[PDB]
Design a protein around this ligand. Structure first.
Ligand code: SAH
Length: 327
DNA sequence: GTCAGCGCATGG
DNA sequence: CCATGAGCTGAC
């Protein structure tokens, strides 16, 4: 993550819904805001959260009375993506994991917060011929909010990963905010090769397969794009090998392949997958964030998360707009 | 609960 | 034509 000197959000309160690892909390606390409630149902996600932050999040959001929830200024939520992702079956609102949005709307109507900050995958914007995005937009307008949305690739904001998400920001209509803007891009100066651990710590992750086929030669100069060097098996998900001189592919949570969830990379003559700590780094997490003791769950957790840096830049801008109140 | 072979929509 | 994806499904 990056360091913020001008703490634009001091004094405001927020809630962490679908908490996961607490990615929304790190970003917002770095700007001076305060957390007053959290909710996450996964047994193991709850353990890591407690380890790092010191409190257990409440359970199942679908059976919590919206009036119990504390008064807050910003609502944060990165709702489930399985029913909308391009890697799934695309069942949308007919999937029991696709209706979560409406519990958000339910909470919103009661607490009427100042800002609503949501985020999902790129295909969310195109699903069902744009109908799904329309439904979210109209419900927000009807509740008296303005809707601002955009798709941002992580490689444009300092982190070496091709990870495209859609961000949705909503301000209550009586605040009359007319100057919010999505952050401007810059040049990338860090590559996969700058975050790797020493060879002695990652020896156990090596894989020597006899069906390895090199289709491209290693490159000699860095570039901001995924460079594919080879394949194993039929070249499906988890069977593709890339260069450490380019950028990483999107990390996932339920993926397969011999190089499951992270993909394979050509490191010093060898082919291996990433270590959990190296995953933390490509997601923007600091080396002081304690990871889960079980390697298996650690990978799933990081693949469901958000990239800190992008959230930080957007949070600064939300505060700047709120603080501009001239005579 | 963990592991790995897979098969298709989307966007050029 | 060619490359990708906060996935699915069945095995133990
Ligand atoms: N009904 C429900 N109640 C609470 N949490 C739920 C839920 N259904 C799914 N979830 C949780 O929603 C999360 C979706 S992914 C969100 C990750 C989070 N932004 C982070 O910073 O890491 C997962 O942790 C999932 O277990």
């Amino acid at each position: 993550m990056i360091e913020i000197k001008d703490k634009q959000l001091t004094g405001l309160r927020f809630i962490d819904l679908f908490a996961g690892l607490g990615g929304f909390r790190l970003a917002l606390e770095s700007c001076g805001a305060e957390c007053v409630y959290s909710n996450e149902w996964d047994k193991y996600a709850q353990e890591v959260y407690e380890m790092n932050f010191g409190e257990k999040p409440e359970g199942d959001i679908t059976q919590v009375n919206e009036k119990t929830i504390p008064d807050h200024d910003i609502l944060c939520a990165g709702f489930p993506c399985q029913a909308f992702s391009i890697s799934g079956k695309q069942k949308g609102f007919e999937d029991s994991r696709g209706t979560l949005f409406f519990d958000i709307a339910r909470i919103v109507r009661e607490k009427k917060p100042k800002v609503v900050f949501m985020e999902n995958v790129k295909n969310f914007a195109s699903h069902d011929n744009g109908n799904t995005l329309e439904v979210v937009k109209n419900t927000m307008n009807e509740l008296d909010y303005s809707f601002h949305a955009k798709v941002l690739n992580a490689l444009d904001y300092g982190i070496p990963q091709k990870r495209e998400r859609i961000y949705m920001i909503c301000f209550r209509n009586d605040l009359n905010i007319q100057n919010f803007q999505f952050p401007k891009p810059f040049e990338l100066n860090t590559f996969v090769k700058d975050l790797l651990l020493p060879d002695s710590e990652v020896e156990h992750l090596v894989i020597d397969r006899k069906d390895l086929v090199m289709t491209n030669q290693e490159i000699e100069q860095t570039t901001p794009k995924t460079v594919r060097l080879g394949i194993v098996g039929k070249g499906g998900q988890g069977e593709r090998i890339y260069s450490t001189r380019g950028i990483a592919i999107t990390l996932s949570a339920y993926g397969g392949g011999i190089f499951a969830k992270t993909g394979g990379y050509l490191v010093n003559g060898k082919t291996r997958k990433l270590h959990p700590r190296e995953c933390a780094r490509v997601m923007g997490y600091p080396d002081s964030y304690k990871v889960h003791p079980s390697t298996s769950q650690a990978y799933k957790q990081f693949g469901n998360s958000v990239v800190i840096n992008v959230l930080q830049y957007i949070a600064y801008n939300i505060g700047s707009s709120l603080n501009f109140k001239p005579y």
